[PDB]
Amino acid sequence: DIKAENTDANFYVCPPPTGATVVQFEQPRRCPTRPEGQNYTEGIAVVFKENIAPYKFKATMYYKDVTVSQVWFGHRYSQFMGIFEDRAPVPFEEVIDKINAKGVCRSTAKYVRNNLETTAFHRDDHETDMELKPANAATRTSRGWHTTDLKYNPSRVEAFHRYGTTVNCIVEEVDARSVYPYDEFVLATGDFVYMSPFYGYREGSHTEHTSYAADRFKQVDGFYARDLTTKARATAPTTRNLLTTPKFTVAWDWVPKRPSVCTMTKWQEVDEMLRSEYGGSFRFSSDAISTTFTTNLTEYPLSRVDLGDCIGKDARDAMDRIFARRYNATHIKVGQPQYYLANGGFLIAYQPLLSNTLAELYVREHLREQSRKPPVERIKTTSSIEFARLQFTYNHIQRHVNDMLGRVAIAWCELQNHELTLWNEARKLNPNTIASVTVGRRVSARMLGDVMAVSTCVPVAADNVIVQNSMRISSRPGACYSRPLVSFRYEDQGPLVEGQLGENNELRLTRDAIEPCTVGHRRYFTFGGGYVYFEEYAYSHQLSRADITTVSTFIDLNITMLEDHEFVPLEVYTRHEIKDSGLLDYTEVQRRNQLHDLRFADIDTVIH
Amino acid sequence: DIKAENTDANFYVCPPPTGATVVQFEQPRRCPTRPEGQNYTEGIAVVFKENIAPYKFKATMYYKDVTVSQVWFGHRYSQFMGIFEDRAPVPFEEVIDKINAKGVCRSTAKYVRNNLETTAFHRDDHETDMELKPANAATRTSRGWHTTDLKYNPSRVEAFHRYGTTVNCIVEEVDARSVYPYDEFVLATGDFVYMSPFYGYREGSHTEHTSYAADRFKQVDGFYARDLTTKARATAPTTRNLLTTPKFTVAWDWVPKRPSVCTMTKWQEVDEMLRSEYGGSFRFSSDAISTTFTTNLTEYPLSRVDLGDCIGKDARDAMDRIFARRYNATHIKVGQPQYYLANGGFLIAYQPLLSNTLAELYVREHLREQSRKPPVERIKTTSSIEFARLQFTYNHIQRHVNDMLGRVAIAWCELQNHELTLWNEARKLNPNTIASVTVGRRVSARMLGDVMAVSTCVPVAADNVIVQNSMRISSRPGACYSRPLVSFRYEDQGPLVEGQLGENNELRLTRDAIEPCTVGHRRYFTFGGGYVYFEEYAYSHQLSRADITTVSTFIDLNITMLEDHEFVPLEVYTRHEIKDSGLLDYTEVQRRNQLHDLRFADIDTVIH
Amino acid sequence: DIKAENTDANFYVCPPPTGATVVQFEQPRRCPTRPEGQNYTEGIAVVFKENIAPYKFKATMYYKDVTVSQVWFGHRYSQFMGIFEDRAPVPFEEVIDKINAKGVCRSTAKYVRNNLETTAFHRDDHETDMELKPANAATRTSRGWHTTDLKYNPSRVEAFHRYGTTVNCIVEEVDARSVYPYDEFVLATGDFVYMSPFYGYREGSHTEHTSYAADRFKQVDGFYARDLTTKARATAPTTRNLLTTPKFTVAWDWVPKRPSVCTMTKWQEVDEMLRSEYGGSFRFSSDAISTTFTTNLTEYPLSRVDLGDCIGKDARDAMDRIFARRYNATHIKVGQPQYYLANGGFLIAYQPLLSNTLAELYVREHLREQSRKPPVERIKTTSSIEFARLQFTYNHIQRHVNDMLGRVAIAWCELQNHELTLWNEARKLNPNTIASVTVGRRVSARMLGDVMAVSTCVPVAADNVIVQNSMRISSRPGACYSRPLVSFRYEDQGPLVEGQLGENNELRLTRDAIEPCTVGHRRYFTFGGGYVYFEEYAYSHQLSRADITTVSTFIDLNITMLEDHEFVPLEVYTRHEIKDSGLLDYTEVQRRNQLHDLRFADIDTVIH
Numbered sequence A, B, C: 001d002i003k004a005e006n007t008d009a010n011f012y013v014c015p016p017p018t019g020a021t022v023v024q025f026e027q028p029r030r031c032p033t034r035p036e037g038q039n040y041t042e043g044i045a046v047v048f049k050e051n052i053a054p055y056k057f058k059a060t061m062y063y064k065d066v067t068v069s070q071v072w073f074g075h076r077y078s079q080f081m082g083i084f085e086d087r088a089p090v091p092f093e094e095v096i097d098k099i100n101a102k103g104v105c106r107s108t109a110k111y112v113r114n115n116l117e118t119t120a121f122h123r124d125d126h127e128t129d130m131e132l133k134p135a136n137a138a139t140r141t142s143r144g145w146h147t148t149d150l151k152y153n154p155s156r157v158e159a160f161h162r163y164g165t166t167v168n169c170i171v172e173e174v175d176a177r178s179v180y181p182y183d184e185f186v187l188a189t190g191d192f193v194y195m196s197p198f199y200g201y202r203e204g205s206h207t208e209h210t211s212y213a214a215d216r217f218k219q220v221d222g223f224y225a226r227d228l229t230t231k232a233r234a235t236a237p238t239t240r241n242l243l244t245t246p247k248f249t250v251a252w253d254w255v256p257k258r259p260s261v262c263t264m265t266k267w268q269e270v271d272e273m274l275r276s277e278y279g280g281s282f283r284f285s286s287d288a289i290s291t292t293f294t295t296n297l298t299e300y301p302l303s304r305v306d307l308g309d310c311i312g313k314d315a316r317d318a319m320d321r322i323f324a325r326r327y328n329a330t331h332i333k334v335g336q337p338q339y340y341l342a343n344g345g346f347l348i349a350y351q352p353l354l355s356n357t358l359a360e361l362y363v364r365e366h367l368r369e370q371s372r373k374p375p376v377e378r379i380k381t382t383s384s385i386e387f388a389r390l391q392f393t394y395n396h397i398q399r400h401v402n403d404m405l406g407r408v409a410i411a412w413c414e415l416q417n418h419e420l421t422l423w424n425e426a427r428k429l430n431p432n433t434i435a436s437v438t439v440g441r442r443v444s445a446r447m448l449g450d451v452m453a454v455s456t457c458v459p460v461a462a463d464n465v466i467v468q469n470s471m472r473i474s475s476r477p478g479a480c481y482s483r484p485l486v487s488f489r490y491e492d493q494g495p496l497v498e499g500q501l502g503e504n505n506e507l508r509l510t511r512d513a514i515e516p517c518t519v520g521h522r523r524y525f526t527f528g529g530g531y532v533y534f535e536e537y538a539y540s541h542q543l544s545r546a547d548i549t550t551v552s553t554f555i556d557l558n559i560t561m562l563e564d565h566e567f568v569p570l571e572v573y574t575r576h577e578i579k580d581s582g583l584l585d586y587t588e589v590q591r592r593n594q595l596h597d598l599r600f601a602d603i604d605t606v607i608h
């Protein structure tokens, strides 16, 4: 008769289970809890870095340009037999009396050179106090004053060597720069001075390093400087230093050391700096600069910092300013400011805050912020902050992803527990399909009260199943079968079995499934890889799944992967671009300069 | 009789609910929608940075080495009483006529020094034009030419001071470098020249800065240079400059200023630069360099840029080249190129594109790209691009994570809405278990049509429950109980209640649960923390959950957390390694050099 | 009679479906698998960078300070007519014999200058061997020795020019520095020396670059140096070099070249460096420094590296040390160390490891690590490692997110497949509501065996529905209706239809829904946007959803988005701060220094 038109499936005989095998459903699981969560402290921060910048100040130089030339005369020319140039230090006396008082300078220089007291005379005449005319126009320089525009040369005497002295008294304002430990400094002209710029008398600054004779240094109390250009006196009374070097004299207003230098520099003021304790370490996170710093749980004492006067003062001046701008009505200062040393060598000044609304915790926390209180050297700061920003970025994504998937993991678990209650009611309705989906294999099931009995199924080949043409019971008219009759064999050569088709291609051995006849009885029955269609209890034809419209119970979820991505090296200016930005390269110049003999002369030839 | 073998659970009496308390299920919720999503513009980009590189050019120096020595003679030695060295500037005349025309130089130097016209004679003889032999072998230098290899010294005259003049005419090619604002420059020898390298006559370049006398400068139109080595003339006619300084004369081919300098440098050409509007700002993202830039919605006018000629020209030359390589058949140029200033001080040249397939929007968008059109100073570029790459990385992960969890949130909601339809049918089947799971507490339920009536349950201690030995009804044989009989008391000292065991350890008060007897009736019934097993309506024994095979209805989901991770500071070369890479340190050298008197002499002793 | 109190809903007439339209549920889907996952190799790494640091060594200088002064006398002063200073190279002879043997130096200098053999006499007397007293106190300098503290000046002779010679024999220890390609070097004093620091005799180091005469260089085998301060000889016998320049003589112990220089520097030792193959490239990831490097699958041969002796030696010395500390009992070395060149110009030395527990794969993998084995130039290393840390951070988050959502996608799919089994049983119970939720529209459904027949519903306006007051059947007492009677019309002007209220506001056309009467029959029935309440089969009143307590079947899931975040540019020290940290700026100084004539004199005036 009729075999299956679709052979791409299996049939199963499903005998009733005895109770030899019994199973139960797993009870609901204890669901994970959301973590308590990191507690953040609100605070104002000031981050500090290593000071790499030198101390800078204003200074004035006083010297003279002593030039002695030697000229020869012939027919009819002249030729310098030599030009001797030297720098003569202007003694304290002339500066205060001739310059700063009148604006004039001497036409004579007198100084110590190579262990002899030499004396020069401008124009080889005698003393004459000469006004200090401003220096010629030159951009990006300080002001300057000279007394003579010209070099003096001897009158012509044929076939003779004559000498001419020139004296130009020079006063220029210069910048001075000193580096740690501030025991010597340099001028804009390139001259070194081997003394601390804080060497004076007032207070204990006479302890500073000097390498010159005591008589080279003098300090004037109440020194009223007079602008050599506007001829104006100074309304302010400044203390003024004067050191006389072998080549010059340097004047500058003296100032105390500590309130003027610092081995630390204020870097970032942070309005909202959240501190969380995490792992026996502190995390100072700033949303505004995307930076997270890591420190120990103990403060760093500023008494361990060499020359760190500016730290306390700068940290307070900012915090007060910020507190008054942002928190002057919303929070409360909890304790004095704190200082922690962060990885990378950053010093963090921190002022814990507490919300007005939660003021009931002040004491509880005030005690805590006092636990961290501190019971000389130099801090070294890295040049790259990128690690602390990697930290910040990573922590933030990490915290978010873990939070969210954590929530999903819980919601997933709750839903599994809840749906068990549906599975429990479903299993009574259709023990076979439920048990099969639960276990993972087509089995036969039957409730034994509260547990579920399970027996295995037996496969039957598709070509071994024949469906009978009719569904009407001839013996007792007025009654028919609900589902079609079938015949089959387990093995290919075996005998036929009288059976009835059940759901899911199950072959039932009892033909008991009986219903009273009806009109227009049209049914589709699952049969093989498709359906068999009956019309009024008579076989019509078979058909395929594709012939019937499909609708889904499934809820779509469209997850795609985040693709691989390659980060290439990328620099704004490469290390070489930075080197080449310098206008002159000392090394390059010296290398050429010192090749000059080799390139253009002969250092390996003696004449006799 | 028989108590519970497992006392680790609860029993509940569940009286029928009246209707005093009624509940309903929450209707389906409005599910969230997926956001519309950022629209990206396809475009070609050229990113620009601050130009930190100086202008560089070729120059030739012309000077002479005037050396006058003084020697003394004894028995039987010689000793230099002095050596006077000077650099004599070669006048325009000799360069064009003797050098560039023949290759020879004069044996005499004549120049201005200390306000006197001096004159030198090589070998103290008279004029003699001397060929310019190439300079000696020296690596990594330019070429050079000198006329004399030797210094001339006077013939021996016992007990006498004699003088000897030496003249070496020198011509070397040198590199020149100038920095913004290009009003002076330096040579490779270290010499400064206080004039703009664009100072000439042609066009309006006579306006450039100079600080020398007019007669120091001359320019030759059509200057045919002659290679002093190969003796070859220049086939090309160049305009040539000549400035005469107090120490030398510098020659170099003159060129216009604007098409030769720029305060900006092309940094990255970007094939695909996506621009999205987001937050009243633009985002220029480049997948290729992993960089996202942030700019305002308005272009930056190039008319605000000082010396930015190269920007327009370079930006176009690249975009055209790229368009022709990649988009010459796929897209359409939309408007002229645009320029936006990005955070960090990056100038972005941008050319919007439009896909051929979507050409119907040209006008619609062409109008938009014209809205941004612009209706002198210096741009400052940071050295660190890392922020814009942090930006890029973060945005990309952010966009992906939000997209995906967004989808989950929707799919989760849809599934909750869908399953309600199962809960609705389940509640009819087992109002007690469904109501209990829904509320959260063991209650008793009953449908009142479309709402659900709920009463509370009553707990009964485990030790207060006894299960009867039989399940057979003695009064009417041929009928038995479905579930075992029980007896219990609410309070420990109270009286016994005739009852029947229901599902989930419920104690039913009516013993109505009756079924017709059967053969082989074996049932497991939930009882306490385990099951009670009956066989043919007679008590067999109790047992524990562990005694029965467990199968799960639950679908596993294995979510683990992304662990904490610490980013340490890491530098390739530390700030100090970069300092020390320099071969000579000017500061270190000067500090030693200027200590020399102090270390090896006496600057504090006068002899008389 | 009674209309709906809540008009905010719809009613539907749901006629039985014929079988004209039939649907089926979508079968379970094939669920995605978890990917196999990247396999990591455990290994020890040593990362190498470009060596930017010069070669540094100790050197001694030997020269003399020859000073000849000229003084004039008057009434009653003195004035230097000139001071000639020169540096005289100390010949090999005096250093070994007078200095290194006794500690004394000559009072005479004899040397070659400007092609003449000059000779100087200290104090203008004759030879006298003078002890070398230590140099004066000066911080941060090396030691030094001079013979004379004073400059000698001639005795006073009125109206006469007299000359005085001074000789100071000087010996100072200096540091020397040379850069690639190491063919010349510099001293701390700033002097250049144009010879390779490896120029000697022993081995083939006579091939090094020199630019001086052969007689300028001498090497002493077995040179026992004597400390000029402690008067102590050297117990060690060193080979010693002596080069004599025109200005000085430099001595230094000679050493071989290759084992002393390198164009590469060890940067990071990495304990655990995981290597994975991914995309025809290798990924070397280090958890400890948060860095992921990218290389080709082929080793880089060290034979392609110029002067890379240190690489092999340093890479082994560390790996052995580390292996012995960490893996001396846990893993096995697999092959000789390997070298790969990574993007950014990093050289990675790698030693693959294998866990003892998985030793069965040695051969299988030993063969593989030999496939990569290599069958001169300079490597260039970027200054920024940030890209490889971006890489690391991104990959790690990427891997985690994809893993987890991947798992969710699978678990989601499995749950959809599992719940179908519930939907299958539910549809028999309530074909109307199930079919409606499945399709998406209120339809009418009926099972046709195994498929489901579906017809559309018809909407009826709310104001068109009237609910009858009673529920009792007058004709046959002892029986009532389960759900209320209703009357309605499809169109507003149409006729009334006798009908019964079903679930979900369906209007049933057959009034068959009949139950036997009961006492206390109180029911709530869905009616419009609320319920209608009956009490003992008689209409009571209507009410709203809000009047009844709501309980939810829904499981909450609380997903929030990860917000936008802006990364601002942030630098620790800006490019300008780094420039200004230098104490002296060569360029700044030279610019001032060379302005001095222009500012303070006149270079444009001839006197006659």
Ligand SMILES: *[C@@H]1O[C@H](CO)[C@@H](O[C@@H]2O[C@H](CO)[C@@H](O)[C@H](O)[C@H]2NC(C)=O)[C@H](O)[C@H]1NC(C)=O
Residues within 6 Å of the ligand: A324, A325, A326, A327, A328, A329
């Ligand atoms: C505390 O913070 C608030 C923040 O707005 C300040 O409010 C402003 O205060 C200034 C001057 O104090 C007023 O001119 C402004 O009009 C205020 N802003 C408004 C009204 O929006 C407040 O002043 C701060 N308190 C102190 C003492 O500085």
Ligand SMILES: *[C@@H]1O[C@H](CO)[C@@H](O[C@@H]2O[C@H](CO)[C@@H](O)[C@H](O)[C@H]2NC(C)=O)[C@H](O)[C@H]1NC(C)=O
Residues within 6 Å of the ligand: A294, A295, A296, A341, A342, A343
């Ligand atoms: C926080 O305190 C710890 C103390 O455990 C410091 O650890 C030091 O780490 C360095 C580097 O490895 C070691 O050389 C020291 O010996 C450690 N100190 C001690 C006491 O063991 C750590 O440096 C502190 N953090 C900061 C930022 O200073």
Ligand SMILES: *[C@@H]1O[C@H](CO)[C@@H](O[C@@H]2O[C@H](CO)[C@@H](O)[C@H](O)[C@H]2NC(C)=O)[C@H](O)[C@H]1NC(C)=O
Residues within 6 Å of the ligand: B324, B325, B326, B327, B328, B329
């Ligand atoms: C536009 O882009 C396409 C991209 O492939 C170019 O195609 C190549 O064109 C060159 C020369 O124009 C041919 O030699 C190649 O064989 C082409 N590549 C192939 C066939 O794969 C195209 O030429 C471009 N158009 C212009 C005008 O440059």
Ligand SMILES: *[C@@H]1O[C@H](CO)[C@@H](O[C@@H]2O[C@H](CO)[C@@H](O)[C@H](O)[C@H]2NC(C)=O)[C@H](O)[C@H]1NC(C)=O
Residues within 6 Å of the ligand: B294, B295, B296, B341, B342, B343
């Ligand atoms: C985009 O336009 C805004 C205008 O709101 C610019 O904002 C400036 O921000 C700086 C730094 O805080 C302020 O000093 C200026 O006063 C602001 N300008 C104005 C007009 O308020 C912003 O700089 C622009 N973006 C770029 C990259 O230039």
Ligand SMILES: *[C@@H]1O[C@H](CO)[C@@H](O[C@@H]2O[C@H](CO)[C@@H](O)[C@H](O)[C@H]2NC(C)=O)[C@H](O)[C@H]1NC(C)=O
Residues within 6 Å of the ligand: C324, C325, C326, C327, C328, C329
């Ligand atoms: C191999 O590694 C283990 C790691 O602990 C080493 O164990 C330590 O070894 C040292 C000296 O070898 C002992 O002083 C320590 O007490 C050991 N640590 C303990 C016991 O915790 C082991 O020694 C290593 N092997 C070699 C040969 O170095």
Ligand SMILES: *[C@@H]1O[C@H](CO)[C@@H](O[C@@H]2O[C@H](CO)[C@@H](O)[C@H](O)[C@H]2NC(C)=O)[C@H](O)[C@H]1NC(C)=O
Residues within 6 Å of the ligand: C294, C295, C296, C341, C342, C343
């Ligand atoms: C890995 O091998 C590839 C070979 O395909 C190298 O690719 C080179 O890439 C540069 C830059 O684009 C090109 O200039 C070369 O022409 C390419 N080489 C070849 C043979 O095509 C790549 O450089 C290698 N990786 C490393 C780190 O060296």
Ligand SMILES: *[C@@H]1O[C@H](CO)[C@@H](O)[C@H](O)[C@H]1NC(C)=O
Residues within 6 Å of the ligand: A556, A558, A560
């Ligand atoms: C899911 O999205 C991917 C790409 O985003 C698309 O290819 C696929 O067709 C989508 N499928 C569904 C069912 O949304």
Ligand SMILES: *[C@@H]1O[C@H](CO)[C@@H](O)[C@H](O)[C@H]1NC(C)=O
Residues within 6 Å of the ligand: B556, B558, B560
């Ligand atoms: C889930 O994964 C974790 C680690 O990935 C493992 O410990 C656990 O046994 C796994 N459980 C299941 C049910 O997959």
Ligand SMILES: *[C@@H]1O[C@H](CO)[C@@H](O)[C@H](O)[C@H]1NC(C)=O
Residues within 6 Å of the ligand: C556, C558, C560
């Ligand atoms: C979910 O969380 C958000 C914020 O985290 C909160 O506003 C909302 O009330 C929460 N809702 C539930 C049902 O958890």
Ligand SMILES: [Cl-]
Residues within 6 Å of the ligand: A283, A285, A292, A391, A392, A395, A396
């Ligand atoms: Cl953080």
Ligand SMILES: [Cl-]
Residues within 6 Å of the ligand: B283, B285, B292, B391, B392, B395, B396
């Ligand atoms: Cl982006």
Ligand SMILES: [Cl-]
Residues within 6 Å of the ligand: C283, C285, C292, C391, C392, C395, C396
């Ligand atoms: Cl990785």
